Amino acid sequence: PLVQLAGIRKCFDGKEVIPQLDLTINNGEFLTLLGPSGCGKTTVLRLIAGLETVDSGRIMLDNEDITHVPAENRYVNTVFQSYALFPHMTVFENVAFGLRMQKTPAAEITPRVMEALRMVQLETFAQRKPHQLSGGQQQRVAIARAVVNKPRLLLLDQSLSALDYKLRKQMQNELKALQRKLGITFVFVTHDQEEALTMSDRIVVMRDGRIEQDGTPREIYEEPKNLFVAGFIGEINMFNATVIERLDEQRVRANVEGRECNIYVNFAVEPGQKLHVLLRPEDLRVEEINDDNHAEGLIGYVRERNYKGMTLESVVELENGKMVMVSEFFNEDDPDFDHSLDQKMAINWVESWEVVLA
Amino acid sequence: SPLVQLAGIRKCFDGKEVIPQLDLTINNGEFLTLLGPSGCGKTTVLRLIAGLETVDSGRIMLDNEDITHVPAENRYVNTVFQSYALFPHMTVFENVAFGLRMQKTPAAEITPRVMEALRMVQLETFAQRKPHQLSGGQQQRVAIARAVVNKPRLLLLDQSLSALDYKLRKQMQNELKALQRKLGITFVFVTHDQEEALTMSDRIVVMRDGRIEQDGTPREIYEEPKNLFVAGFIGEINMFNATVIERLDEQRVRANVEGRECNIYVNFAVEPGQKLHVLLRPEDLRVEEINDDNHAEGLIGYVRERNYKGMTLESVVELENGKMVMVSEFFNEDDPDFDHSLDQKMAINWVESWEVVLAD
Amino acid sequence: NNTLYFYNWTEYVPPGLLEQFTKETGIKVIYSTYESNETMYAKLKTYKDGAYDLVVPSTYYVDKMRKEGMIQKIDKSKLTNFSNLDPDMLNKPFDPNNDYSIPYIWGATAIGVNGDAVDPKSVTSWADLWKPEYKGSLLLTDDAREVFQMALRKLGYSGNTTDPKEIEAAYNELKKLMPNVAAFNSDNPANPYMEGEVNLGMIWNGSAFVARQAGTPIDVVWPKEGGIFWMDSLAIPANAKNKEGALKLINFLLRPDVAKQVAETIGYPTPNLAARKLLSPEVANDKTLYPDAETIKNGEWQNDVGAASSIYEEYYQKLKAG
Amino acid sequence: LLRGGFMTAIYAYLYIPIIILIVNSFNSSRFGINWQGFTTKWYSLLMNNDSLLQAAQHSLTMAVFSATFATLIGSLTAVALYRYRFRGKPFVSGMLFVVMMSPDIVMAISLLVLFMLLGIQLGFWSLLFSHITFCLPFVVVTVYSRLKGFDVRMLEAAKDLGASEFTILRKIILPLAMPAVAAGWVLSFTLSMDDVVVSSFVTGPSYEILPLKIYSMVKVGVSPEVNALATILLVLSLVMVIASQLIAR
Amino acid sequence: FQNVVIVTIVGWLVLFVFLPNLMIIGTSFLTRDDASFVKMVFTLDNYTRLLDPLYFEVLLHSLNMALIATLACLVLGYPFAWFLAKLPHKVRPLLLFLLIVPFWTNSLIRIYGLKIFLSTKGYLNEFLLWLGVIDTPIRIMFTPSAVIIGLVYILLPFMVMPLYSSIEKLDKPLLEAARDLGASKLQTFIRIIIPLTMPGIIAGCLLVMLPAMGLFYVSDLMGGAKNLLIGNVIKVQFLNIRDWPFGAATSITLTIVMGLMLLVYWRASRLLN
């Protein structure tokens, strides 16, 4: 363990933002905190960094208590959303600030700064003020400033949010490679789902100052734990179910949205219980019906279609009046296929690729 | 059916030529999107149509009436801006009714129209609440309502939905498509995003340095690229270099693509020894991982990254050449779950006749 | 029903006097103040042609101001109160027939001292001020003639001198007194005494009266080298609009009752013989306001110099900057 | 705290002489060094003082006129800068900054020589022009900084909706600017009240104003009518600040 | 209209601001005359008289008394504006407004009031007498100290307002970022806060030092004979002695300082943007 948190509380203007948190951070992992806007991720990041002081609890770093050490003495460095980047100093002095303030002997400042600038591909822009660089280069200067001091934990805070949609794809992989090459923990704060899924090795999902789920992306996307998590990342379809009778230990009989078929369930039920049915849009099969044979699935309709390039996404409406939003792929046996509007449809899923909740 | 016709527009600003020479036609009842890199002159075209700038040579036509020198006060065109351009001291009702008041509408007809315009956009109850008490989405909605109540012939939009978040943007895209279907008037939409261009458009124009590169349906621009820029702009493409050996039959040609020989499909006439460009998408590459010197048909490369997006799995595999190619494979088939290592050795193939070969 | 502009000295008109005049003739009067003769001179030449209606020059400029053409005839028939004035000070060489000025108020200037700090006997002559024991504490008046008719009477000369060798003898000797001056006051030379900052220096006798009618023992010790005497007169500038109004105000200040109400409050000796008698035993008796006939003839009056005016002034303005 | 002690001192330093000119207004000693009882004689003596009342009247009329015209011209200039963008804008901004960073004695002597060469008598008009001249920049800065906090795209949006160039002024720009137009009129009124350096140079005997009359009395230092005239103008100044806020909204 | 507004504003500035300064620089060179105040004859005699030790030690003493007032404003006003920017947002408009209310009382009377408050027999000597701290009074009139106190007392609000904007307009993240990297409260002040706020410091000295050499009534009421400011010299020349060319030649020591301090403002503003 690198950082242990024990019973943290923090209050702001009389309103609570962090009730209780116990969280452990290991050595050499890429951790991400994901949640809705303004849910106390920033406060936890600042407490680890040292820019705020706790009301109760304990923070430990390799078993040395750091609860009341000042911010300028910890070995944790932080990267900001707006790339702090003092405007009146060149890139070289911006990087060398930390070295100068820690009484580094003057013999080695130049090599260390140059190596740190090389880690991020900014060798040539060493004498250029931080207004004649572009956005990405400013991001890189901030990261290099953070890394040169050899910290034990890097905190990134909406690091890549202002950049366009191709530079973000490049820089996510760049950060992923840098983390492996260095060997120290990266804590990341984000509000986007795809970035959290693609860049991380472990996810902690937070809502209003409490931890909801904590695990690797496979676990959170495939086997959620409640309705907030299953619905925060990825689009999800919720179907209301009422149980009729049990068939065996793996299959159960129930009515869902007017049709009565069998749903796989793996917990104890009694007749009359209400259950929740969840399905991802990609795991849901669809087939047009023009003939009079209306069977094998719910009725539905189509109100909207969207050519995604790679995929095709439709919004359907059942007999009740609920949207299901199915997604489809382009295979060899079915290239170029398209829908019309108000085409009567037939919806069915793929036999045990669902999760059912209490 | 012709509605707007740009025939020979020329425009310069600060001694620089921004629109060299542009010929374009806009139909009635459709949904057109102008797409390109930042600062390729989409904004200037939109402004020239709207009336906030004047041309140097050429004529702009609206329903067989020349409007090249009618000010931005008598044209039947309305515009939606990017900062929402809201008057902060007036109420929502006054913001919407401004356009009516400037046209001398009888006092008895104002309120029902304003309430209808607020209703098409779901702001019935916020009629008497000033801005700065509204969220971002609601300011966008009020701007659209302010635009539409005058009954224009063409509603121009300028990067309208960029300041919002993800799910709300994804909702309001469908909202806009529904509105366009209801009203029956042409929508012109300027954007930098590729997915939002493919999702909701019915005709796409791609602009780079003032020239129209291509025009057509989204499937025509994603499946039939005309040059390298269009292929690499929307979506992701894999550029390959190939050299031609000889012909096989009326529809196949031998080639030396990245060091090995493989049958490719080239429709047009080919002579040995020329340079070809083979373009493939991460859509179409099929990859199999080879353990111990078995089934080594195809290119040989090594994996460097692995990115799980929940529905698919992208991996950048680097070839022996040193070339990075993007692979995208899905879980929707009966492969429940899989994952790669960081130095695993892979074989690359692709499905027949799904290539795109370009000359020069 | 017109109005007049009255341009006068600092502390002559007491509050209320001009309010009386209005309710008697219907004329409104606007009032301003001097601090010296050179300031009055410059004002009248910049804003020429009708800026003022009634100046109050000192007698030793009534001759100078005639030839430049800034004073005019005074019609002497409507001035029907002239007789009450003292005939003693009424025919002197500067204005023979009194067609140019009418005497207003005279006065004196001698050493002032504070009893609570300095003994009024330890200083008795002008020369005691040059002592090197009074560095940086001495109030001096701010008139070129007064400051110069003190070194001339110290070395021994006539205060009314027109010789470039005695005036230049004054400067060289009066420039050794500057290491002792702390202020140059000519608006109310009693305030630095009443505030507690200076305790020795030149003082006008009338101003020391006002500080003894309040709480402070300022004693006017006369110097052995003499005493500086002066007189002021009323005049009408050449280009004026209320010609009638200017006369009707001089005719009001020559009345006995008017001239004694002011004379008692300000303590400056009056040249009005008629009102010189109707007075209090503390105003019309004090040795420092109205002196004997032995002291008036031991000091020198301020007479005209002529065209050596500039030499006195030009040396003065270099003495200040030290 | 000692932090509050630092702020307590600076306010006491600035507020002690103000209290003295109020305490000594009701004092009876004509000099003001000590305390000698209570009286209301001085105010009544002021009420009959013709010269000082005329001087105060001239001060008020000049302040009103100068403030009004300066507000109008400066507000229009700020609208011109906010609405349009051209090449000379940084140059004009620098011109205004340099004018505002200018010594007052140099301005006084320069306006004296200018009015002497052309041949205009010193009096009412010269004082008016000088007051407008040194009041403009503050009006310009205030209105422009008020307007700079809003989107400029409103004006294009108004044009697209079918509005003339004059209707934009009445219905959009002017309502957004009134809270700063009023703050400029009051600020201009304040300066023209207590300006001493320029007035001492560029006015004559004809039109006399309060700084000059107070100067003489303060040097002579015998008349506490001055202290009483000061406390009236403070009350009259605090009612305009309050009245402006009600009218501006 | 469109161009009338721009034409009038540049017409006003050319006639009333910039052309008259060239008139003064031009008249610093003509000869004296008793009729038209000038006579069209070119001399350098006016400038040579300034280097006379008689009329040159006055400028040096007038400049020492203006710096010390200006350094006093920085030392006292910088902490005052820094503490005020650390208060609840609901009380700031109260304390700022209570700092501007003195101006509605005439400035010429507030100095006369301060003259009483520091006299030998006035208040603060009798009050501080009977509370046993001094044996004999404190005399601070007619001394260089008196004029400096009067200068600081009037011109202090002109230093707080420019400093207040440039402190309130700092980016908070910049201050937090230095704290992470290992910077104490002293190195944060020397190496970040001072350079970011330098254009606000130079602006203050412009509004304090230049008027401090033109306020002739602090010297009239409180200075005496040995303590003069330049503003007194020009008033004496232009209205009593009536030597306009020498009076104008004195004013140019005041335009030179305006130019040099403005240059530092343009150059120190570019370093930041």
Q: Do C5 and D33 touch (CB under 8 A)?
A: no
Chain E residues within 8 angstroms (CB to CB) of chain C:
54-55, 58, 119-122, 137, 139, 141-142, 224-226, 228, 236, 239-242
How far, in Å, are C131, D239, E65 from residue E230 at the CA level? 32, 38, 11
Q: Is C197 annotated as a binding residue?
A: no
Among B187, B207, B232, residue at a domain's last position:
B232
C159 phi, psi to nearest 5 deg: -60, -35
Can you tell me the distance from the alpha carbon of C143 to that of C145, in angstroms, rounded to the nearest whole number? 6
**Looking at the DSSP assignment, which residues form a beta bridge with residue B26?**
B4
Q: Least CB-CB distance to A173: which of B177, B219, B305?
A: B305
Can you tell me the distance from the alpha carbon of B191 to that of B38, in angstroms, rounded to the nearest whole number? 9
Interface test with D, best of B49, B81, B90, B155 (most D CBs within 10 A): B81
Nearest to A347 by CA among A311, A308, A301, A312: A301
How far, in Å, are A166, A180, B84, D73 from residue D146 at the CA level? 40, 52, 20, 16
Report yes or no: D198 and D108 within 8 Å, Cβ to Cβ: yes
Can you tell me the distance from the alpha carbon of D168 to that of A1, in angstroms, rounded to the nearest whole number? 65
Q: Do D157 and B73 touch (CB under 8 A)?
A: no
Can you tell me the distance from the alpha carbon of C84 to that of C87, in angstroms, rounded to the nearest whole number? 9
Query: The domain spanning residue B155 has which CATH number?
Result: 3.40.50.300
E173: distance to nearest CA of chain A, Å? Answer: 6
Can you tell me the distance from the alpha carbon of C105 to that of C94, in angstroms, rounded to the nearest whole number? 16
Helix boundaries (H) for C102-242: 144-148, 152-155, 167-174, 191-195, 205-212
Nearest to B73 by CA among B110, B117, B115, B104: B104
Tokens of D247: 């009218």
Report yes or no: D17 and E117 within 8 Å, Cβ to Cβ: yes
**Looking at the DSSP assignment, which residues form a beta bridge with residue C29?**
C4
Is the C-alpha dihedral spanning C33, C37, C39, C45 positive or negative? positive
Structure-determination technique: cryo-EM
Report yes or no: A338 and A312 within 8 Å, Cβ to Cβ: yes
Look at chain D and report how many structural domains it folds into: 2
How far, in Å, are C214, C220, D148, E137 from residue C291 at the CA level? 22, 12, 76, 37
Residues D155 and D190 in one domain: yes
Is D44 domain-assigned? no
Place of tokens 């506490």: D224
Phi-psi region of A29 (alpha: psi -120 to 50; beta: other; left: phi over 0): beta
Domains and CATH numbers, chain C: 3-106+231-277 (3.40.190.10), 107-229+296-320 (3.40.190.10)
Nearest to C103 by CA among C11, C14, C247, C234: C234
Query: The domain spanning residue D185 has which CATH number?
Result: 1.10.3720.10
Residues D27 and D139 in one domain: no
Tokens of D85: 């963008």
Judge residue C122's burial from the number of C-beta atoms within 10 Å of its C-beta, 0-12 exposed, 13-18 middle, 19 or more buried.
exposed
Report yes or no: C309 and E45 within 8 Å, Cβ to Cβ: no
Among B232, B257, B287, residue at a domain's last position:
B232
Report yes or no: C266 and C14 within 8 Å, Cβ to Cβ: yes
Amino acid identity at B6: L
Q: Do E173 and A82 touch (CB under 8 A)?
A: yes
Amino acid identity at E35: A
Residues 6+ apart with CB under 8 A from E26: none
Nearest to A21 by CA among A50, A54, A63, A49: A54
Residue D5 is part of which domain span?
A: 1-39
Can you tell me the distance from the alpha carbon of B218 to that of B202, in angstroms, rounded to the nearest whole number? 7
Q: Which residues of B touch A202 (CB under 8 A)?
A: none
Is D55 domain-assigned? yes
Residues 6+ apart with CB under 8 A from C207: C11, C188, C189, C190
How far, in Å, are A277, A278, A320 from residue A255 at the CA level? 11, 14, 14
Q: Least CB-CB distance to C196: which of E54, E120, E228?
A: E120
Nearest to A209 by CA among A21, A11, A5: A21
Place of tokens 């999902």: A205
Nearest to B287 by CA among B299, B269, B304: B299
- Tell me the angle at which helices D50-83 and D124-147 cross, rounded to the nearest 10 degrees: 40
The DSSP code for E86 is: T
Q: Which residues of B touch A217 (CB under 8 A)?
A: 308, 310
Nearest to C126 by CA among C221, C30, C238: C221
CATH class assigned to E50-270: mainly alpha
Residues B149 and B257 in one domain: no
- Tell me the angle at which helices E144-155 and E53-84 cross, rounded to the nearest 10 degrees: 40
Residues A66 and A101 in one domain: yes
Can you tell me the distance from the alpha carbon of C311 to that of C144, in angstroms, rounded to the nearest whole number? 10
Among B186, B213, B232, residue at a domain's last position:
B232
Q: Is C19 annotated as a binding residue?
A: no
How far, in Å, are A152, B148, C55, C68, C162 from residue C93 at the CA level? 106, 101, 21, 18, 17
Q: Least CB-CB distance to D196: which of E24, E113, E217?
A: E217
Residues A135 and A251 in one domain: no
Report yes or no: D213 and E230 within 8 Å, Cβ to Cβ: no
A242: distance to nearest CA of chain B, Å? Answer: 28
D163: distance to nearest CA of chain E, Å? Answer: 16
Q: Do A101 and E183 touch (CB under 8 A)?
A: yes
Is D142 domain-assigned? yes
Q: Which residues of C touch D220 (CB under 8 A)?
A: 10-11, 33, 187-188
**3-class SS of residue A319:** coil
Q: Least CB-CB distance to A71: which of E173, E180, E195?
A: E180
Q: Which residues of A touch B191 (CB under 8 A)?
A: none
Residues 6+ apart with CB under 8 A from E174: A84, A86, E192, E196
Q: Give strand ranges (E) for chain B.
A: 2-13, 16-27, 31-35, 57-62, 77-80, 154-158, 186-191, 203-208, 211-216, 238-249, 252-257, 260-261, 275-280, 285-289, 299-303, 307-308, 312-319, 324-330, 345-350, 356-359
Tokens of E126: 């009798």
Report yes or no: D143 and D75 within 8 Å, Cβ to Cβ: yes
Is D46 domain-assigned? no
Residues D64 and D32 in one domain: no
**3-class SS of residue B306:** coil
Q: What are chain E's partners, defined as 3 or more CB pairs within 8 angstroms?
A: A, C, D
Tokens of D86: 């051209």
Tokens of E114: 């301060």
Angle at CA of residue B58, ends B56 and B64, nearest 5°? 135
Q: What are chain B's partners, defined as 3 or more CB pairs within 8 angstroms?
A: A, D
Is D45 domain-assigned? no
The DSSP code for C301 is: B
Q: Least CB-CB distance to D220: which of C28, C188, C194?
A: C188
Partner D contacted by E26 (CB < 8 A): no
Q: Do D50 and C19 touch (CB under 8 A)?
A: yes
Residues B305 and B355 in one domain: yes
Report yes or no: C289 and C210 within 8 Å, Cβ to Cβ: no
Residue B14 is part of which domain span?
A: 2-232
Q: DSSP string covering C28-46, please? A: EEEEEE-SSHHHHHHHHHH
**3-class SS of residue A139:** helix
Can you tell me the distance from the alpha carbon of D211 to that of D230, in angstroms, rounded to the nearest whole number? 11
Report yes or no: B7 and B67 within 8 Å, Cβ to Cβ: no
Q: Least CB-CB distance to D99: which of E17, E80, E112?
A: E17
Tokens of D243: 């009245």
Q: Do B73 and D162 touch (CB under 8 A)?
A: yes
Residues B188 and B254 in one domain: no
Query: Count of residues for chain D?
Result: 249
Query: The domain spanning residue B289 has which CATH number?
Result: 2.40.50.140
Residues 6+ apart with CB under 8 A from A195: A160, A168, A172
Whole-number CA gyration radius for chain E? 23
Q: Do B52 and D159 touch (CB under 8 A)?
A: yes
Residues D76 and D197 in one domain: yes
**3-class SS of residue E33:** coil
A245-267 core/surface letters (b: 16 or more CB in 10 A; e: else): eeeeeeebebebbeeeeebebee
- In what helix (H) or strand (E) does residue A212 lie, and over which residues does it extend? strand A210-215
Please report how many Cα atoms fall inside a 13 Å half-sphere around the Cα of residue B7, on the Cβ side.
12
Nearest to B20 by CA among B49, B50, B58, B54: B58
Residues D19 and D57 in one domain: no
Judge residue A341's burial from the number of C-beta atoms within 10 Å of its C-beta, 0-12 exposed, 13-18 middle, 19 or more buried.
exposed
Look at chain A and report how many structural domains it folds into: 2
Residues 6+ apart with CB under 8 A from E242: C42, C45, C46, E37
Nearest to A331 by CA among E5, B301, B332: B332
A200 phi, psi to nearest 5 deg: -105, 165
Judge residue E261's burial from the number of C-beta atoms within 10 Å of its C-beta, 0-12 exposed, 13-18 middle, 19 or more buried.
middle
Nearest to E243 by CA among E50, E18, E4: E50
Residues A179 and A94 in one domain: yes
Report yes or no: C161 and C167 within 8 Å, Cβ to Cβ: yes
Can you tell me the distance from the alpha carbon of E64 to that of E58, in angstroms, rounded to the nearest whole number? 10
Q: Least CB-CB distance to E113: which of D17, D102, D194?
A: D17
Helices (H) and strands (E) in chain A, counts: 8, 21
Q: Do D49 and C15 touch (CB under 8 A)?
A: yes
Residues B10 and B77 in one domain: yes
Angle at CA of residue B286, ends B258 and A354, nearest 5°? 155
Residues D33 and D59 in one domain: no
Can you tell me the distance from the alpha carbon of E14 to that of E12, in angstroms, rounded to the nearest whole number? 6
Q: Do E247 and D24 touch (CB under 8 A)?
A: no
Amino acid identity at A353: W
Q: Do C30 and D204 touch (CB under 8 A)?
A: no
**3-class SS of residue E264:** helix
Report yes or no: C125 and C118 within 8 Å, Cβ to Cβ: no
